[PDB]
Write an enzyme that holds these catalytic residues in place. Structure first.
Site, mmCIF file in Angstrom:
data_model
loop_
_atom_site.group_PDB
_atom_site.id
_atom_site.type_symbol
_atom_site.label_atom_id
_atom_site.label_comp_id
_atom_site.label_asym_id
_atom_site.label_seq_id
_atom_site.Cartn_x
_atom_site.Cartn_y
_atom_site.Cartn_z
ATOM 1 N N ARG A 124 -3.976 -10.308 -14.904
ATOM 2 C CA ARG A 124 -3.251 -9.137 -15.205
ATOM 3 C C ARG A 124 -2.625 -8.825 -13.818
ATOM 4 O O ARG A 124 -2.950 -8.116 -13.077
ATOM 5 C CB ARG A 124 -4.181 -8.038 -15.600
ATOM 6 N N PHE A 129 3.560 -4.021 -8.638
ATOM 7 C CA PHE A 129 2.447 -2.913 -9.132
ATOM 8 C C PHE A 129 1.146 -3.183 -8.911
ATOM 9 O O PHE A 129 0.551 -2.479 -8.293
ATOM 10 C CB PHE A 129 2.874 -2.675 -10.408
ATOM 11 N N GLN A 132 -4.394 -7.850 -10.782
ATOM 12 C CA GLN A 132 -5.814 -8.012 -11.167
ATOM 13 C C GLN A 132 -6.253 -8.907 -11.650
ATOM 14 O O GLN A 132 -6.012 -9.703 -12.441
ATOM 15 C CB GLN A 132 -6.003 -6.843 -12.194
ATOM 16 N N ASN A 171 -9.851 -1.561 -13.186
ATOM 17 C CA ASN A 171 -10.426 -1.185 -14.281
ATOM 18 C C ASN A 171 -10.073 -1.882 -15.585
ATOM 19 O O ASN A 171 -9.025 -2.319 -15.518
ATOM 20 C CB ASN A 171 -10.619 0.252 -14.243
ATOM 21 N N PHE A 178 -7.716 -5.405 -8.014
ATOM 22 C CA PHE A 178 -6.346 -5.457 -7.868
ATOM 23 C C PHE A 178 -5.760 -5.554 -6.698
ATOM 24 O O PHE A 178 -6.096 -4.565 -5.729
ATOM 25 C CB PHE A 178 -5.750 -4.347 -8.853
ATOM 26 N N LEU A 187 -0.763 5.240 -9.857
ATOM 27 C CA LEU A 187 -2.028 4.795 -10.183
ATOM 28 C C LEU A 187 -3.001 5.160 -9.493
ATOM 29 O O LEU A 187 -4.254 4.900 -9.519
ATOM 30 C CB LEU A 187 -2.020 3.224 -10.470
ATOM 31 N N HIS A 191 -7.527 4.197 -9.967
ATOM 32 C CA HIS A 191 -7.871 2.962 -9.099
ATOM 33 C C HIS A 191 -8.283 3.024 -7.915
ATOM 34 O O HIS A 191 -7.140 3.646 -7.192
ATOM 35 C CB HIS A 191 -6.817 1.850 -9.416
#
Ligand SMILES: [Zn+2]
Lengths: 223, 106, 78, 101, 410
Positions: A124, A129, A132, A171, A178, A187, A191
């Site tokens: 991910r 951005f 993860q 998550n 991340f 975010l 997170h």
């Protein structure tokens, strides 16, 4: 000034490094061609002016009592994009802000819990951005397990992803973590940011540039 | 932390009223650990001992008009430079540095 | 924020695939993923108007981890 | 160590009178490489001082460490524009002589 | 009881009361400069502040902003100085403590209200920034201490005094302009050649009330200053002084008669003439002296009140109404500033319907009213009902349908 900067000796080991220095108390060789030997006493710590360029497995290892060859735990993971290394992200996981997530990232790098970031991949990854990974069960961010079980709560969101190399617990935070290469204040509140790579920020930028089009996996990792 | 605050105030009063807090920890522990410098309460214990010593020094009265003069004295005893630094950082980025005109060299 | 602007996907994860992912994780009452008059294709970066503000936050938190059409889906509060 | 000082002065109240403090406060010198330029000659460091009204004036220092002072001030948190300009340069706005040392 | 720890806490509270006033002076040092300029006209022995710094509202280098607000800050500073002197006068006249601290040690509570409360209740109630006053003077307002005409120690109300003087004169020939000119005398003018007699029953009854109101207005204007010290100085000056002297008339008595010489002026008080006047008109002469001292103290305020009365007299009706509205807005403000119709017919939109569950929200047409039962704020309506968002909860539009919820049958 009891620590050395012995280089020029990956085939070496801790016993072979400490056999020439034996009363060395600490001997932590880096993943590159460098090691540091520290003696507890004062007369035994002057090995730089006494056994310089010592033969270590048919190889000379020059020893200098300095810190040229190189609290919050640092997850030092050689994150490799594909079959080549994209850099050694020495992400200093912020134990002052989120100590549970920082210890989870440090243990995932050190692979002391049986699974973690040493050998896992980041499936991910977004452009500037988030990136993860750390999920060693499903390898997509949909698996993973923390120390308290499959899912664990975030420790604290005092830190923020305000720059490159900032690490957060992805998550609700299990084994997913991340790394952020830019501002991620949208975010925030979901997170918990638990790191800031003072070293390996270029490795985090390379991971963000590569992210997934390539298998970005830290095969070698540690504390 | 009421019990710890009262024990620290009692230890500071016994020190400022300089061997009682050292003798009590040697005679008896964890309750008498406020005199040590490893904890962060040593500066607060020193401030409380100094306040107790200043209370016992005048033991006189304060006759401070004069209170407003002392308030004005304590009132009497950055942003422009930060704004100038921000304007210089904006101007150095907005000015083209590629147009280098050589006048001297070293 | 009744709508969760869900993006980070491609044309394969369109408005209808976002509605399918809403039926999976957190439901969308409506979809605002309009297109131009020359193209007419749903890019998938659209405001999925969820069932509530908590449903849009659930789309922003739980449903923003899918690898939607190969890219990692990210929903934000709108 | 070795130091290079360039003293550039402006006009004596000739063209500076033509004036509402638009980023007047100061010229700063940046160490720019010659590998990218508006770029026939490369592999050279130039301390270029650029002003708002006045054009950029560059002093070419071929040394990689030419008066590169480190730890000169006693922990002063003034970033301004550049580290070398904040450490080894002066802004004499009264005599209109911004020196790049 | 720990008397030494109480004295240490009182000294810490005095230091915090000094520091809280220092922070208020650093925030707005114009009030301190205005109080120093007001006290320079009363006490001459005190040193004066810098004129340029008082004009620019600065103490050393930093110029503070302009801050009703000055009167509220002066009242809060007077309350803090009254609290500081009371705590000073309270304090003016080990092993057993450590052993008793271990009793009831199993207490899951936080105790951090030792010395921070004295600074928190004196720092210049409010949540973040709503009032410039502290917690001790959070309910303090200038409306119960000043009238509408004065506008927080900026003017004086002389219209009631003018009407009382007209009632004492028992005529209607007294205007607004004559009273301010007649009251300008009140050093020996008001005792011998005043507008009214010195011992008149109609005039003196209004004059004593006017002197008391002038002293109250002067105390409200100089509440930050030493009002008791100023009253003691004004009493001591009258006790020391023989004050009214003439070249030929020599000294007069406030009896309304002069003496031939100072030897006769001292012996006149021991006779039956001046002693009856001093025994029956001591309060009237003291009220006249207090009115003269208050007029001398607030002569700039009296001139401002006279200029405002002249502006109201020379203005028009609309200008006077605008001036009264501006004075009321200054007095009653805070200290610190902050389609066709066939669609309407053949769709049900001609009849509007309200749903009680969604806060009794009214929507046009029956379709939106029955579409309330799948909504967002109306779903908060069922959340307030406590029934889950089901078809049976959707079938009812009233609040009373929640009694047939999931916790009704099973
Ligand atoms: Zn309704």
């Amino acid at each position: 000034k009891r620590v050395l900067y012995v280089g020029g000796l990956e085939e070496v080991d801790d016993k072979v490094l400490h056999a020439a220095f034996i009363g060395d108390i600490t001997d932590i060789q880096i993943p590159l061609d460098y090691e540091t030997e520290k003696h507890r006493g004062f007369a035994f710590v002057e090995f730089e002016l006494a056994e310089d360029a010592a033969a270590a497995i048919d190889n000379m290892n020059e020893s200098e009592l300095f810190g040229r060859t190189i609290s919050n735990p640092q997850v030092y993971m050689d994150i490799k994009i594909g079959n080549k290394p994209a850099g050694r992200i020495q992400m200093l996981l912020r134990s002052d802000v989120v100590p549970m997530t920082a210890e989870n990232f440090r243990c995932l790098c050190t692979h002391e819990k049986g699974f973690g970031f040493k050998g896992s991949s980041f499936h991910r990854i977004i452009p500037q951005f988030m990136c993860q990974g750390g999920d060693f069960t499903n390898h997509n961010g949909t698996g993973g397990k923390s120390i308290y079980g499959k899912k664990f709560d975030d420790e604290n969101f005092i830190l923020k992803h305000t720059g490159p190399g900032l690490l957060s617990m992805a998550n609700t935070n299990g084994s997913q973590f991340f790394l952020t290469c830019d501002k991620t204040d949208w975010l925030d509140g979901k997170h918990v940011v638990f790191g800031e790579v003072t070293e390996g920020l270029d490795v985090l930028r390379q991971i963000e540039a590569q992210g997934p089009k390539q298998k970005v996996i830290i095969a070698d990792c540690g504390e | 932390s009421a019990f710890d605050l009262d024990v620290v105030k009692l230890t500071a009063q016994f020190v400022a009223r300089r061997q009682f807090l050292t003798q009590l920890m040697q005679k008896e522990n964890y309750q008498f650990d406020f005199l040590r410098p490893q904890h962060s309460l040593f500066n607060y214990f020193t401030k409380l001992v100094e306040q107790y010593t200043k209370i016992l020094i005048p033991p006189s009265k304060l006759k401070k008009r004069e209170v407003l003069d002392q308030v004005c004295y304590r009132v009497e005893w950055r942003k422009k430079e930060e704004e100038e630094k921000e304007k210089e950082r904006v101007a150095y980025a907005q000015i083209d540095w590629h147009d280098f005109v050589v006048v001297e060299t070293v | 924020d009744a709508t969760v602007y869900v993006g980070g996907l491609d044309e394969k994860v369109s408005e209808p695939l976002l509605w399918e992912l809403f039926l999976q994780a957190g439901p969308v009452v409506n979809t605002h993923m309009p297109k131009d008059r020359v193209t007419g294709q749903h890019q998938g970066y659209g405001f999925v108007e969820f069932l509530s503000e908590e449903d849009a936050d659930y789309a922003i938190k739980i449903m923003n981890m899918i690898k939607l059409y190969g890219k990692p889906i990210r929903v934000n509060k709108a | 160590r070795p130091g290079y000082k360039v003293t550039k002065q402006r006009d004596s109240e000739m063209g500076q009178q033509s004036d509402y403090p638009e980023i007047a406060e100061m010229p700063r010198h940046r160490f720019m490489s010659a590998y990218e330029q508006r770029p026939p000659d490369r592999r050279w460091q130039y301390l270029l001082m650029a002003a708002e009204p006045y054009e950029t004036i560059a002093f070419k220092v071929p040394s990689r460490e030419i008066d590169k002072a480190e730890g000169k001030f006693w922990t002063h948190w003034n970033r301004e524009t550049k580290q070398f300009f904040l450490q080894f340069h002066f802004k004499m706005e009264k005599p209109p002589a911004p020196p790049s040392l | 009881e720990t008397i030494l720890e109480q004295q240490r806490r009182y000294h810490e509270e005095k230091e915090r009361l000094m520091d809280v006033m220092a922070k208020e002076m650093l925030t707005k040092k114009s009030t301190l400069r205005d109080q120093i300029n007001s006290d320079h006209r009363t006490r001459a022995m005190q040193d004066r502040y810098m004129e340029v710094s008082g004009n620019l509202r600065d103490l050393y280098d930093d110029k503070d902003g302009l801050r009703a607000e000055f009167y509220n800050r002066l009242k809060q500073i007077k309350e803090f100085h009254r609290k500081h002197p009371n705590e000073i006068c309270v304090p003016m006249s080990l092993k057993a403590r450590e052993n008793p601290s271990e009793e009831a040690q199993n207490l899951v509570e936080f105790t951090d209200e030792e010395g921070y409360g004295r600074y928190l209740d004196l720092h210049d109630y409010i949540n973040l920034k709503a009032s410039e006053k502290l917690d001790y003077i959070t309910y303090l307002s200038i409306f119960d201490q000043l009238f509408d005409i004065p506008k927080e120690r900026k003017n004086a109300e002389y219209k009631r005094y003018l009407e009382m003087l007209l009632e004492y004169l028992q005529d209607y020939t007294d205007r607004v302009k004559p009273l301010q000119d007649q009251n300008e005398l009140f050093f020996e003018k008001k005792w011998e050649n005043g507008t009214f007699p010195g011992w008149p029953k109609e005039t003196s009854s209004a004059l004593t009330h006017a002197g008391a109101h002038l002293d109250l207005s002067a105390f409200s204007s100089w509440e930050e200053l030493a009002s008791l010290g100023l009253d003691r100085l004004k009493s001591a000056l009258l006790a020391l002084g023989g004050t009214l002297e003439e070249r030929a008339q020599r000294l007069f008595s406030t009896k309304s008669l002069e003496s031939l010489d100072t030897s006769l002026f001292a012996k006149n008080p021991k006779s039956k003439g001046t002693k009856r006047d001093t025994e029956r008109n001591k309060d009237i002469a003291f009220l006249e002296a207090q009115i003269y001292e208050y007029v001398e103290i607030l002569g700039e305020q009296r001139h401002l009140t006279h200029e405002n009365v002249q502006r109201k007299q020379a203005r028009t009706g609309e200008e006077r109404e605008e001036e009264e509205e501006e004075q009321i807005s200054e007095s009653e403000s805070e200290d610190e500033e902050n389609i066709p119709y066939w669609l309407y017919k053949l769709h049900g939109l001609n009849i509007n319907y309200n749903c009680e569950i969604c806060g009794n929200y009214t929507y046009r047409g029956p379709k939106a009213f029955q579409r309330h039962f799948a909504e967002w704020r109306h779903a908060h309506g069922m959340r307030c009902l406590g029934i889950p968002n089901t078809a049976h909860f959707a079938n009812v539009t009233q609040i009373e349908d929640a009694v047939s919820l999931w916790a009704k049958l099973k």
